[PDB]
Structure formats: structure tokens, C-alpha cells
């Protein structure tokens, strides 16, 4: 299967949606330490298996729009 967020190879559904280790890892950390990001452009940055790390804001948002739901993330 494929990560619905970046197109990288997925290996399960994590937090509700077919996602890759990276996107899952990223989503988890974002919630766990409750981080807020800011896009240096607009809010339509590419975010794929190659550029996903160019904008934390757009990556997270895309996590949200793809179905990744919080609540599925426990803590410490």
C-alpha cells in the first residue's frame, strides 16, 4: 500500500490512514509535544516522498486532511 500523505511506501494505517513510517512518526511527534508550525510560503507546498520535509506546516495539515486523526495518539 501507499502513504496517502506523501506517496511513500506504506506499511499499515497508523492513526487512521494508510501512511508511511515518516508521516506516522511526524504526526505522532507533532501531537505528543503539541507543536505549532508556520509555512514560509502559503499553505499549498508540495509534500511528497521527496519534498515532505520542506514544510512542516503543510505536511501536518496534509496529515489532517488525509484522515489522520489525533485521539489515536496516546502520550508518554
Amino acid at each position: 500500500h501507499l502513504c496517502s500523505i506523501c506517496g511513500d511506501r506504506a506499511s499499515g494505517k497508523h492513526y487512521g490512514v494508510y501512511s508511511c513510517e515518516g508521516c506516522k512518526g511526524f504526526f505522532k511527534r507533532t501531537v505528543r509535544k503539541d507543536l505549532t508550525y508556520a509555512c514560509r510560503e502559503n499553505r499549498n507546498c508540495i509534500i511528497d516522498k521527496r519534498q515532505r520535509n520542506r514544510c512542516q506546516y503543510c505536511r501536518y495539515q496534509k496529515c489532517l486532511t488525509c484522515g489522520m486523526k489525533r485521539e489515536a495518539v496516546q502520550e508518554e
Binding site: 511513500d8 516522498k49 521527496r50 519534498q51
Partner: protein
């Protein structure tokens, strides 16, 4: 933008004699200082991009070299 000769990310300058990005600059520097030897777990012909660069250290180091990054300029004696 400019382009890293290795992965196509944005180059930040010439590093060890080749136009490359911060990622490749650091990957090259670490690999050389430790004299690391990698083994491609794929077909030994990986094409580099921002995704593949993290996936194959051997093919990335070879590309680094092919593009002109100079190992001998990595922390030389003085």
C-alpha cells in the same frame, strides 16, 4: 534555484569542489572522515533525488564522487 549536482535539491554552495546541497555536503563529509564503505542493497545503479539520497548511501557516495566532491579535501593535514 541552482541545483546540487548529486540530488537536485537546492545547492547552498560549492562543497569540496562541487555545487551541492547541505545534505550531500554533510553526507560526504561524514562518509569520508569515517572512511565508510557502503553496500547498495538494490541494483547498484540507484538514480539520486531527494528521496533516493536517504535510501542508498553507496549510490549517493558514488554520485558525490562522480560529480567532483574531493575526499582529499575533507579535513586534510592543515
Amino acid at each position: 534555484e541552482e541545483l546540487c549536482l548529486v540530488c537536485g535539491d537546492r545547492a547552498s554552495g560549492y562543497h569540496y569542489n562541487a555545487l551541492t546541497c547541505e545534505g550531500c555536503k554533510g553526507f560526504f563529509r561524514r562518509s569520508v572522515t569515517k572512511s565508510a564503505v557502503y553496500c547498495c542493497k538494490f541494483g547498484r545503479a540507484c538514480e539520486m533525488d531527494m528521496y533516493m539520497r536517504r535510501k542508498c548511501q553507496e549510490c549517493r557516495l558514488k554520485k558525490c564522487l562522480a560529480v567532483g566532491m574531493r575526499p582529499e579535501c575533507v579535513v586534510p593535514e592543515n
